[PDB]
């Protein structure tokens, strides 16, 4: 009632002038010593050319050689970057996928979509086939981002504004975030697999905590959706691409907003982000047909990954940081370089 | 310049592409309808006939339909709605008879304008399906539609409040021509309802053949 | 679980068209790659033929070219060997190794019961020195296996297996690719090397290690098996 929305309120307010306190100066003014990255030159060194329809994510295994990729027609493809094999070709129950993993060990895969079920596929088996090794269920609403935390515990985030941290032995929920006003769109862990933070669809991205759940922090001033949202490799920042063409990075211990990468060209959303190795370069996977690398440090675009004939709809970077893969909502992927 | 393993590995990817364009092949045949609503417009009425997406497989005149039901997932529609786009058809079922309050003609207006005017649907035919015809057969013979539609001028009678309900929701749209929007009372219990579904999906699989050979 | 057992042996007399059938049950028969492997009682082993997935891919040694008949049954599991015109000399004992190859599978991880066959009366070479080392528990042992061609290929990987026959029973898959330890076999084992030079190191060397140890190839076919190093005490 009243009084309650009246202490939320200046609370509120008190934490946003902290937080202005507690800015001096953005890092454009600090780094605009140093020199720009200069112009990228991307060249495809290898196209996929599996699939049939829409593709939707795909995830690097840890070996940076094995990448799965999910698509529409229901099939879940394993790939050999290297010699653009097919290691598997998996038959998913549902069709509509919007999501896939692939765990630290390379064991198992996760698959998950409109189903509101996401299901654990085993890979190295006696019989010599891939089959299901545990089906999660317990969501109200679709599947947006699946993420292993190891070969056990697996973190899913889905459309009923509702993160969850599963238990693939014992198969239901060990732990359940709640603190969203809208469907929550995407994932990521820290490298340290210790905290993740997930992009809600109220522009509002929170920081939480596996150990045993609540809200570190929340970071706001997008104003719209956040599609895609990543870690820094330092494990200290995170990058977020909304749908109003922008991508912002924010920094955890500072609690406040940084850098926006915006041009006026661009007025499509973003689909994916992603960081290289080192994090100087910002990958980001527009509507417009094509990637834009981002310099992380100057929000000067450094080139353009314009080879797709949709939407990009999907990003990863390999942990050595040698390739990066995307794939469009044609049945195709490129791995640059 | 390839190992034995190597050429063995490579027979395997072969193999498997092999059984995925199979695969492939064998599922472009089918015909996909989205199947939407108001939620108690009598979807399960239209259904009958043959926790999350409900999937309904059934076989008429040597042809495979696979008609979706979304329902229970009650969430921001605009997310997931994009992952339908390239479906066959549309179909839209809203229930005649629950025009009494809490009304719902506009909601079905508000759902059918914001479904039939998406960037993603500019194409796909949309099926209008007219259900629970006795029902507001007996409504609009005990009370006139004034009040659900004030500028209504018209005979107290079904015949021309149907006639004004179907013009209006096809009025209801915007691309004229880019679009086609057909309409059925569907409340008679035989297979005429699924043979107009035929006859659409027919319409529009020669569309869509029309524009491989180029003579669009 | 897998399961694989073969029929068809007996005594024939030379000449004869006797026809090896081996059925198994327990994996996806269709999507595995099959071989056949005899020894000759006294003897090491040696190679016969092999079918691939899909029975698109049908090779022989050239001791037998010409005159051995493979084929596979997908619907029944059943893998066929047809004989023509036998000789003396193919008095053996035959395998039905399985074996899948995809980019970090593990081939010939499962070898088959086997059954025995008596008749009345370019290549590269596998040499493994010794022939028999007596050893003790609690010590660690070393067995060398040496080959004529360099076996590290272009793609960084060396490809040579080794193998464990206990006395008694079929052998079983201890290292494949010469660094990478088979499924279910005790960290124990290891092995390494180089080109043309290979060492199996067993340390803390306990009992249920007894028996012969077999050095194989698998860079161009034909393959051909090591002479074969035996252990006991």
């Known amino acids: 009632l009243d009084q309650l929305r009246q202490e939320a309120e200046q609370l509120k307010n008190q934490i946003r002038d902290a937080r202005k306190a507690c800015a001096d100066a953005t890092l454009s003014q600090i780094t605009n010593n140093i020199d720009p990255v200069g112009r990228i030159q991307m060249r495809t060194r290898r196209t996929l050319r599996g699939h049939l329809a829409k593709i939707y994510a795909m995830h690097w295994g840890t070996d940076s050689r094995l990448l799965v990729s999910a698509s529409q027609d229901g099939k879940l493809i394993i790939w050999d970057s290297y010699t653009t094999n097919k290691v598997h070709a998996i038959p998913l129950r549902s069709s509509w996928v919007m999501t896939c993993a692939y765990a630290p060990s390379g064991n198992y895969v996760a698959c998950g979509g409109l189903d509101n079920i996401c299901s654990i596929y085993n890979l190295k088996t006696r019989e010599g086939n891939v089959r299901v090794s545990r089906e999660l269920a317990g969501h109200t609403g679709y599947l947006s981002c699946c993420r292993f935390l190891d070969d056990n515990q697996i973190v899913t985030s889905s459309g009923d504004t509702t993160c969850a941290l599963w238990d693939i032995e014992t198969g239901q929920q060990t732990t359940t975030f709640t603190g969203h006003t809208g469907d929550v769109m995407s994932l990521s862990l820290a490298p340290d697999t210790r905290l993740f933070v997930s992009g809600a669809c109220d522009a509002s991205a929170k920081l939480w905590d596996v150990r045993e759940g609540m809200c570190r922090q929340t970071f706001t001033g997008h104003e719209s959706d956040i599609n895609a949202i990543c870690f820094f490799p330092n494990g200290n920042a995170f990058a977020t691409g909304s749908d109003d063409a922008t991508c912002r990075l924010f920094d955890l211990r500072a609690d406040q907003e940084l850098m926006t990468y915006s041009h006026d060209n661009i007025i499509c959303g973003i689909t994916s982000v992603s960081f290289s190795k080192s994090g100087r370069l910002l990958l980001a996977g527009y509507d417009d047909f094509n990637c834009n690398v981002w310099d992380a440090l100057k929000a000067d675009r450094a080139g353009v990954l314009a080879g797709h004939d949709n939407r990009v709809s999907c990003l990863g970077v390999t942990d050595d940081g040698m390739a990066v893969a995307t794939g469009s909502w044609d049945s195709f992927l490129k791995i640059w370089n | 310049t390839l190992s034995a393993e190597d050429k063995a590995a490579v027979e395997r990817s072969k193999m498997i592409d092999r059984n995925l364009r199979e695969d492939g092949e064998k599922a472009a045949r089918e015909v996909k309808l989205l199947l939407l609503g108001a939620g108690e417009s009598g979807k399960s009425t239209i259904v009958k006939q043959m926790t999350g997406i409900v999937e309904t497989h059934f076989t008429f005149k040597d042809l495979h339909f696979k008609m979706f039901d979304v329902g229970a997932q009650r969430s921001e529609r605009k997310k997931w709605i994009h992952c339908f786009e390239g479906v066959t058809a549309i179909i839209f079922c809203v229930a005649l008879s629950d025009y009494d309050l809490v009304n719902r003609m506009h909601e079905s207006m508000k759902l059918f304008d914001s479904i039939c005017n998406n960037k993603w649907f500019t194409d796909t035919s949309i099926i209008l399906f007219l259900n629970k015809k006795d029902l507001f057969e007996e409504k609009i013979k005990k009370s006139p539609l004034t009040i659900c539609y004030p500028e209504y001028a018209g005979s107290n009678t079904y015949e021309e409040a149907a006639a004004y309900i179907q013009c209006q929701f096809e009025d209801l749209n915007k691309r004229k021509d880019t679009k086609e929007i057909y309409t059925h009372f569907t409340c008679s219990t035989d297979t005429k309802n699924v043979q107009f579904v035929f006859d659409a999906v027919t319409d529009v699989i020669i569309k869509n053949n029309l524009k491989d050979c180029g003579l669009f | 679980d897998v399961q694989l057992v073969e029929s068809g042996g007996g005594l024939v007399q030379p000449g004869g068209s006797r026809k090896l059938s081996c059925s198994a049950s327990?994996?996806?028969?269709?999507?595995?790659?099959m071989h056949w492997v005899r020894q000759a009682p006294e003897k090491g082993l040696e190679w016969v033929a092999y079918?691939?997935?899909?029975?698109?891919?049908?090779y022989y040694a050239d001791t037998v070219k010409g005159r051995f008949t493979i084929s596979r049954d997908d619907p029944k599991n059943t893998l066929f060997l047809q004989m023509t015109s036998l000789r003396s000399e193919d008095t053996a004992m035959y395998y039905c190794?399985?074996?899948?190859?995809?980019?970090?599978?593990?081939?010939?991880?499962?070898w088959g019961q086997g059954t025995t066959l008596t008749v009345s009366s370019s290549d590269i070479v596998m040499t493994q020195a010794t022939s028999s080392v007596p050893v003790t528990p609690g010590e660690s042992v070393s067995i060398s296996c040496r080959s004529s061609?360099?076996?590290?290929?272009?793609?960084?990987?060396?490809?040579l297996y080794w193998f464990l026959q206990r006395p008694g029973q079929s052998p079983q898959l201890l290292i494949y690719?010469?660094?990478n330890l088979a499924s279910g076999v005790p960290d124990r084992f290891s092995g390494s090397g180089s080109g043309t030079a290979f060492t199996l190191t067993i340390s803390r060397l306990e009992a249920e290690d007894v028996g012969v140890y077999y050095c194989?190839?698998?860079?161009?076919?034909?393959?051909?098996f090591g002479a074969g190093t035996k252990l006991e005490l």
């Open positions: 061609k360099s076996l590290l290929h272009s793609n960084g990987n060396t490809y």
């Open positions: 327990g994996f996806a028969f269709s999507s595995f790659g």
């Open positions: 079918i691939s997935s899909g029975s698109g891919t049908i």
């Open positions: 690719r010469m660094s």
């Open positions: 190794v399985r074996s899948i190859y995809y980019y970090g599978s593990s081939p010939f991880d499962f």
């Open positions: 194989m190839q698998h860079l161009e076919y034909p393959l051909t």
